Amino acid sequence: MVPELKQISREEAMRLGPGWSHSCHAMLYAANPGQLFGRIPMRFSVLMQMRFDGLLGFPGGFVDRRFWSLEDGLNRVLGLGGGLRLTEADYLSSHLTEGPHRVVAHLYARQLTLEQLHAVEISAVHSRDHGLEVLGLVRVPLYTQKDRVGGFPNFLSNAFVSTAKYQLLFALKVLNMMPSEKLAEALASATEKQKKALE
Amino acid sequence: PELKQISREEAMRLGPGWSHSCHAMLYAANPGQLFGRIPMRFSVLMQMRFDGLLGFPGGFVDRRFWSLEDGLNRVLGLGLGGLRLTEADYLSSHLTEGPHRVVAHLYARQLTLEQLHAVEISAVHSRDHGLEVLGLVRVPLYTQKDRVGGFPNFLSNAFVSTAKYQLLFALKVLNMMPSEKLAEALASATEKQKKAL
């Protein structure tokens, strides 16, 4: 169980006054036919990143609406380097963050080929933001090993930007990349792992 | 969780029933400053593994046929891309928490920040990228004004237990961070984790 964030419509988000900050982040993913150890289907690979503050999050950042539309802003704030362009067709959701500052978090999601996803990873290591704001990209493992913790459940027990962890689970669910009951199982495994470490 | 440190010689005398792992801690002094005011001090490479945990580059070495160095370098050739370590880079051997019989050997090498970046570029092109290795990360060793941003948040991630111990061990014995500062970062990380729940 994660703390539920309030979802609002894009139209509502556009009506927000100047006292609201807007963040735009991108969930880039690819179908992945690979099989770990020749037997565990990887299904999809999703990109996240280690941030300067020691937490996992998505590529992106704050967008100043005095100057930019959400899409123009996002494409400018993507510390991936490259030629990838996101459009309003890739817009997925807007959620109000936990605060206390007034922030709406916009999520864009785009499916790429696995070769294109790798090109993004290569671009990122050469990016101006690498080693400053961004400390490295990681692929999310969506599979679970036989021990029932290796892979996705262990991954979910990492330290996230709270908004990004919610957005990841939200997107996996609404984009039909993972059944909800499987997400619940991985999250339960991660949360119990965390609780028993703290004992 | 204190691991028992033993000598290379002791490790070899445990016998054929023991497995050996070798991992490398690659790091660089880093003159950068976060926000132009927070000294970065050093950058250390770790990686996201296939099992969803942070660890160091490296893996199991079959000591029946391989020296620790040759074994390590072959695993690094597939997973980092051709950097080669020597016996001069050997740092420590620890018995891992049981019940499995594993001795964990740690190698450490200081690189320039330029050489460290070359390793990161090599890694994204390596054979193991997207299979056993899911991406490299730099450790943030600084702590932000809120006293959690940076190193304490980082320590609240999920690690191979042995690797987390090895990181803290190496930061101490290599004089990269004072013991009391490490203790302080760990305490903050724990307090973060408990309030997260």
Residue numbers in the entry:
A (entry chain A): 5 to 85, 87 to 204
B (entry chain B): 7 to 203
Excerpt from the publication:
The tumor suppressor p53-binding protein 1 (53BP1) plays a pivotal role in orchestrating the choice of DSB repair pathway. Central to the 53BP1 function is the recruitment of 53BP1 to the damaged chromatin via the recognition of di-methylated lysine 20 of histone H4 (H4K20me2) and ubiquitinated lysine 15 of histone H2A (H2AK15ub). More recently, a Tudor-interacting repair regulator (TIRR) has been characterized as a novel 53BP1 regulator, which directly binds to 53BP1 Tudor domain and blocks its H4K20me2 binding surface. In this study, we report the high-resolution structure of TIRR in complex with the tandem Tudor domain of 53BP1.
